[PDB]
Design a protein around this nucleic acid. Structure first.
Length: 113
RNA sequence: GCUCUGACCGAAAGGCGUGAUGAGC
């Protein structure tokens, strides 16, 4: 995954919360995809463990939900407007960014073809 | 120990989304 396309996602995410709705933390993120409410899922690459966020990759591709990998969990942290680093996040409501997001959805899907 | 909740607990230092708090089992 790109670092250029990565800064984009974080941007969307940080604003997405201003209008739409976002879920922060592996626990809520997982339960989000399991309930088909995961528009997009963010995953940090710098996790401790691994065994703590490893299940997500699979669950998304099988739930037909897009997942994006990000460099630092701290970045995913300040994006979510949280104080503690976040290891994973899932946006459940695109909000007033929907369209602006749908484009990002394809850029990732067009990264695995 | 787990389930649900999901942002606070603390005088402070600090400790929490790798899960504060509060239900339950």
């Amino acid at each position: 995954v790109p670092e250029d396309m990565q800064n984009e996602a974080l941007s969307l995410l940080e604003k997405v919360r201003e209008s739409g709705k976002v879920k922060k933390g592996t626990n809520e993120t997982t339960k989000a995809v399991e309930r088909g409410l995961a528009k997009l899922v963010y995953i940090a690459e710098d996790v401790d463990p691994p065994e703590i966020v490893a299940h997500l990759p699979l669950l998304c591709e099988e739930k037909n939900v897009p997942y994006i990998y990000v460099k630092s969990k701290n970045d995913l942290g300040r994006a979510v407007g949280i104080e503690v680093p976040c290891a994973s996040a899932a946006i459940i409501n695109e909000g007033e960014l929907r369209k602006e997001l749908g484009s990002l959805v394809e850029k990732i899907k067009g990264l695995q073809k």
